Design a protein around this ligand. Structure first.
Ligand code: NI
Length: 341
């Protein structure tokens, strides 16, 4: 059974609610983004209308085989009428194709559902500037002040300078980057661009990237592993054993691996600056964990909500424990008292 924070009141709509069977009263199922916790339940046998971005619809058709007649892609930043209700999709600054949804209810209420997002001051000049929001369904993944991390631009600067130094010192070093979902593509694209190489990967991952509308993608990626000195591997292989095993397959072309594990936040963020980050090393293999987030930090979340001034907040993450719920409610009240709404 579908929980309340996935239903939009006064509509026949649900958001990210595919794992509950046929939901009673639902006439249109919205999907914010192509991550498995959110699409859990979709397949080629789904026969209800799915509303999403263009990029999410390419992934639904090619990767999950959903039939074309049930995929309803909407452009961004454009007022659209769905089953008699005005909606707008906005860029969520999460993974490719990820959106926030504005719903203009028949009774005059306005609801924003963030999906998953990384809040940014540029959202203060979208179509959100123009009108009031009564209810905010909020991605609360890092809603606590301990969750700090650098900008995506600082993280990418560190990765490019680290990779370019290592391969210039040793032209026979391979760079490997872990992945297990869409998102965070700038990590491996920025490293391959500084090295003058295409990125090499499996047929399965090539297929996925080919759905993402990245400009000039054919110039940037390949399935010919032998032609490339930046390889993608499943995240599970990014350890000393998996990397040893991979280096054997490369036919004596390389004598060293430098690997990157993009994570979200980790507790070593509570002590170490990005500049001071060091790898784990065993022999000719070194592994860097880098804190590349596609979710709001605490401070980015707080700024966004203090600007938007919603009347009510419904968290969509960390909802399963009383302690988490109480913590989040305390911060929402502080924010509101401090800003005066
Ligand atoms: Ni996500």
């Amino acid at each position: 059974t579908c929980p309340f924070y996935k239903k939009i009141p006064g509509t026949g709509f649900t958001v990210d609610a595919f794992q509950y069977g046929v939901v009673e009263g639902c006439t249109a199922y919205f999907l914010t983004h192509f991550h498995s916790d959110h699409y859990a339940g979709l397949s080629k046998h789904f026969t209800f209308p799915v509303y999403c971005s263009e990029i999410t619809g390419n992934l639904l058709k090619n990767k999950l085989h959903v039939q074309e007649q049930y995929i309803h892609p909407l452009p961004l930043d454009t007022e659209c009428i769905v089953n008699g209700v005005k909606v707008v999709l906005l860029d969520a600054n999460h993974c490719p194709g990820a959106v926030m949804i504005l719903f203009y209810l028949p009774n005059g209420t306005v609801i924003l559902h963030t999906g998953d997002f990384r809040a940014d001051p540029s959202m203060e000049r979208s179509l959100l500037a123009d009108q009031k929001v009564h209810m905010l369904y909020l991605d609360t993944t890092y809603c606590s002040p301990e969750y700090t991390f650098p900008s995506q631009q600082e993280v990418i600067r560190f990765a490019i300078n680290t990779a370019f130094e290592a391969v210039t010192l040793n032209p026979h070093a391979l760079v490997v980057c872990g992945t297990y979902s869409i998102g965070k593509e700038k990590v491996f694209l920025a490293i391959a661009d500084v090295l003058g190489s295409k990125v090499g990967m499996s047929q399965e991952k090539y297929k996925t990237l080919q759905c993402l509308n990245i400009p000039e993608i054919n110039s940037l990626i390949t399935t010919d592993m032998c032609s490339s000195l930046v390889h993608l591997l499943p995240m599970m292989q990014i350890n000393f054993k998996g990397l040893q095993s991979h280096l054997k397959k490369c036919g004596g072309k390389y004598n060293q691996i430098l690997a990157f594990r993009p994570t979200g936040w980790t507790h070593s963020n509570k002590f170490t600056r990005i500049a001071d980050v060091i790898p784990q090393t065993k022999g000719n293999i070194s592994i860097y964990g880098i804190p590349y987030s596609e979710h709001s930090s605490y401070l980015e979340m707080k700024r966004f909500v203090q600007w938007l001034k919603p009347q009510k907040i419904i968290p969509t993450v960390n909802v399963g424990t009383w302690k988490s719920r109480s913590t989040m409610e305390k911060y929402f009240r502080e924010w509101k008292l401090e800003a005066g709404y």
